Design an enzyme around this catalytic site. Structure first.
Site, short mmCIF file in Angstrom:
data_model
loop_
_atom_site.label_atom_id
_atom_site.label_comp_id
_atom_site.label_asym_id
_atom_site.label_seq_id
_atom_site.Cartn_x
_atom_site.Cartn_y
_atom_site.Cartn_z
CG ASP A 128 -0.54 -0.18 2.51
OD1 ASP A 128 0.67 0.13 2.71
OD2 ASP A 128 -1.29 -0.55 3.43
NE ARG A 177 -1.01 3.11 4.45
CZ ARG A 177 -2.19 2.53 4.31
NH1 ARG A 177 -2.87 2.57 3.16
NH2 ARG A 177 -2.68 1.82 5.35
CG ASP A 206 -3.98 -1.85 6.89
OD1 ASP A 206 -2.86 -1.34 6.61
OD2 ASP A 206 -4.28 -2.47 7.93
CB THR A 207 -1.49 -4.17 1.89
OG1 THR A 207 -0.61 -3.07 2.10
CG2 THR A 207 -2.28 -3.92 0.53
CD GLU A 226 2.88 -2.99 7.74
OE1 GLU A 226 3.94 -2.74 7.12
OE2 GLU A 226 1.87 -2.22 7.74
NE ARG A 239 2.47 6.90 5.31
CZ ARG A 239 1.93 5.79 5.83
NH1 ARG A 239 2.51 4.61 5.61
NH2 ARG A 239 0.76 5.87 6.47
C1 LIG Z 1 -4.35 5.57 5.01
C2 LIG Z 1 -4.01 6.55 6.08
C3 LIG Z 1 -3.13 6.28 7.15
N1 LIG Z 1 -2.94 7.26 8.08
C4 LIG Z 1 -2.02 7.01 9.25
C5 LIG Z 1 -2.95 6.35 10.29
C6 LIG Z 1 -2.08 5.33 10.93
O1 LIG Z 1 -1.32 5.95 12.00
P1 LIG Z 1 -0.37 5.07 13.02
O2 LIG Z 1 0.99 4.96 12.33
O3 LIG Z 1 -0.24 5.94 14.22
O4 LIG Z 1 -0.98 3.73 13.24
C7 LIG Z 1 -1.04 4.96 9.85
C8 LIG Z 1 -1.33 3.64 9.16
O5 LIG Z 1 -0.51 3.58 8.00
P2 LIG Z 1 0.18 2.16 7.68
O6 LIG Z 1 -0.90 1.13 7.50
O7 LIG Z 1 1.00 2.39 6.43
O8 LIG Z 1 1.05 1.73 8.85
O9 LIG Z 1 -1.14 5.95 8.89
C9 LIG Z 1 -3.59 8.52 7.94
O10 LIG Z 1 -3.31 9.36 8.83
N2 LIG Z 1 -4.42 8.83 6.91
C10 LIG Z 1 -4.66 7.86 5.98
O11 LIG Z 1 -5.50 8.12 5.12
CA LIG Z 2 -0.27 -1.51 5.87
#
Ligand SMILES: Cc1cn([C@H]2C[C@H](OP(=O)(O)O)[C@@H](COP(=O)(O)O)O2)c(=O)[nH]c1=O
Ligand SMILES: [Ca+2]
Length: 129
Positions: A15, A29, A34-35, A37, A75
């Site tokens: 993702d 991103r 959510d894929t 890890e 991102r």
């Molecule tokens: C998809 C997405 C993720 N995020 C943030 C929320 C999550 O915060 P936390 O890192 O505190 O969990 C994290 C999840 O991304 P990842 O799934 O790449 O880890 O990215 C956003 O803020 N907006 C978004 O639209």
């Molecule tokens: Ca992910």
């Protein structure tokens, strides 16, 4: 929403990917998904699916939603298209991502993706197997 040009710099995982957008390298991103890890079940399959779709594409485009365009990590948050086909939707339709992180203001394609998730789950694909 509008599609804007970008080019692939490098695949990262299911993702996230590094794209060049307005001539600058950015990690994107994928919105609303959510894929797993890479170290989790179907993580490698997801990473491969997004890497293939992006690398095989003649034209990558990014489409921002109405809300935040960058997350707290810097991102970019977008829908990404590979020869007009949405990567985010495709991952979900294959059971390689779940609809997730649906924040108000950036949720234009939510019901498209939830329809894809339902079909993936009906077919018992991948994550839903
Ligand atoms: C998809 C997405 C993720 N995020 C943030 C929320 C999550 O915060 P936390 O890192 O505190 O969990 C994290 C999840 O991304 P990842 O799934 O790449 O880890 O990215 C956003 O803020 N907006 C978004 O639209
Ligand atoms: Ca992910």
């Amino acid at each position: 929403l509008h599609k804007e040009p970008a080019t692939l710099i490098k695949a990262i995982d299911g993702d996230t990917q590094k794209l060049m957008y307005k001539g600058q390298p950015m990690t994107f991103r994928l919105l609303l998904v959510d894929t797993p890890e890479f170290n989790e079940k179907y993580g490698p399959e997801a990473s491969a699916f997004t890497k293939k779709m992006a690398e095989n594409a003649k034209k990558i485009e990014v489409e921002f939603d109405k809300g935040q365009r960058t997350d707290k990590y810097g991102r970019g948050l977008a829908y990404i298209y590979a020869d007009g086909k949405m990567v985010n939707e495709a991952l979900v339709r294959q059971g390689l991502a779940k609809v997730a992180y649906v924040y108000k203001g950036n949720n234009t394609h939510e019901q498209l993706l939830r329809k894809a998730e339902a079909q993936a789950k009906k077919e018992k694909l991948n994550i839903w197997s």
